[PDB]
Amino acid sequence: EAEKCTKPNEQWTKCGGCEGTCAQKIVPCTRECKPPRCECIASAGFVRDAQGNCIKFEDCPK
């Protein structure tokens, strides 16, 4: 109801910074939340490929 982003994955996220991987949907990160801006979203299910590529969880290798 508040998606002001265009490119895929990169969606509006108030607290950015770290994220999750295809092995750690949740990475331990203190109060290191980046300012509000379009970026990846772990709470939704986006993971960063080993190449640091923010992509849906299903967009993972085999």
Write a three-state SS string for 12-59: EECCECCCCCCCCCCCCCCCCCECCEEECCCCCCEEEECCCEEEECCC
The full set of domains in the chain, from first to last, is 1-62 (2.10.25.10)
- Please check whether residue 55 is in contact with residue 9, taking contact to mean a CB–CB distance below 8 angstroms: yes
Q: Which residues of 42-54 are buried (b: 16+ CB within 10 A; e: fewer)?
A: beeebbbeeeeeb
AA letter at 24: Q
Q: Is 6 left (phi over 0), alpha (psi -120 to 50) or beta?
A: alpha
- Is residue 36 a contact partner of residue 12, using CB atoms and an 8 Å limit? yes
Question: Taking the C-alpha atoms of 16, 18, 21 and 23 in order, what is their torsion angle to the nearest 10 degrees?
Answer: -130
